[PDB]
Structure formats: C-alpha cells, structure tokens
Amino acid sequence: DNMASLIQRIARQASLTFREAPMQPGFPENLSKLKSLLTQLRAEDLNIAPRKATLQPLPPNLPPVTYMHIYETDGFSLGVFLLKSGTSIPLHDHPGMHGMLKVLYGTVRISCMDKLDAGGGQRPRALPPEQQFEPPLQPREREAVRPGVLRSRAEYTEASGPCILTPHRDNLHQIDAVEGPAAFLDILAPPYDPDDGRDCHYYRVLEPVASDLPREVWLLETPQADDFWCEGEPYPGPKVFP
C-alpha cells in the first residue's frame, strides 16, 4: 500500500479527466471515476476541522466566504470555499465549464438553474411588455432579461454525493449555508479567466406580480453584490505535487 493522499489522487484524476495500447479511459469514464474519488473526501482528509457558528453579526470588514487554493492547471482549478453562518454564494454561472463540488462540513442549500438555450431545443422568449416586477425594471434592464428554469433546490451535506454541473445543465447555482457554517471542495474546468473572457456572472431571479420545481423564471444579470466577496486563507491539507 503505497497510496498518495486522497487530494493528490483527486488532482491527478481531474488532470486526466479535463486535460494507445491498451486504450485508456475516455471522458465519461474519467468523470465517473473523479466523482467516485470525490465521494470519499472528508474534511479531515484536508486537515480542515468543522467550524461552528459565530454569534456576532458579520460586519462589512469581514468576508462572508473564504477560499483555500489547492491546485490549478489550465485544465482545472481545485479549491475549498468556506461559508460563514447565514451567508451565501449568490446566484452565478460557469460559462462553458464543467464543475463538481463536495460538501466537507455543514449543510448547504444549492439552487440549480439554467438559462433557456435554443441549442437545447428550447425557444427562449423575449420579456413581454405587459408583465412587471417588484421592484420595477428600468427599460434597458427589460431588454436584458433572459428566460431560465429553476430546476432544483435541495440541501446537501458531507454525506450527499457530489453535485455536478455541465456547460448546459445546472450551469447556474446559488449556495446558501444552512443553520451554520459550511464548506465545500469545488472543481471547475476550465478555470475561470476574467482576463480572457470567461467570467463568473451573477444573476437575480425576478419577482413578478405554485412553488413546484422545475418552473420557468426570468433572470437578470447583475454586478457582484456590494457585500459579497471571498478572500483567501491558508490551505492546511496535504500538498498537491508538484
């Protein structure tokens, strides 16, 4: 038994997944193997202890979420996001990216959405002039409204399987920490690159004047929220080599 750390094995397999005799795995098989490794991942595998709620309100001085960088190549990024109590990663997309996440401690509510896409056989409609929202929309925001669907809204814990998204399915999500702090490992491929036109866009669901899922919604892109930001903090777990 000469095994590497689980995080090193996760990183290797992500590298093979997202990048003659005998034939080595294809992408579906490699993705399924990656997901099998992520199912085994515990917070203790990363030397991260669970965090319990702090009682003081979160002042503007402090970030609601922190990030621990683990590894990245041009194929994928590998990190941990740690959410304080009562905080959220607001609704955002992953343009042309695959993603996999695994809760390490706590509980999160993940709301999974998609913009309606004519490449998927949908026929996205323009926002009709009649319907209105609270708050009302400025005219040019009306022109930017895009139809979407809210697919699911479930709670995940470290006992749940990994949450997977693709470039065209569950590509938008919001992550709420439920009843205390929470953390999750995230794999994204390719990584974001704000300087090469692959950005994290934020969105809001419009409130127009049945709670059943799935349901159609209207989505409006929005700037990163004033009070949402995510600063780094030291990663304490095993190093990914080199």
- Which residue ranges make up the annotated binding site? 92, 94, 173
**Burial status of residue 198 (CB atoms within 10 A of its CB: 0-12, 13-18, 19 or more):** middle
Query: Which H or E element spans position 183?
Result: strand 182-189
Q: Are 144 and 207 in contact (CB under 8 A)?
A: no
Q: Are 203 and 221 in contact (CB under 8 A)?
A: yes
Q: Which residues are annotated as a binding site for Fe cation?
A: 92, 94, 173
Q: Are 172 and 115 in contact (CB under 8 A)?
A: yes
Closest CA to 220 of 125, 92, 87: 92
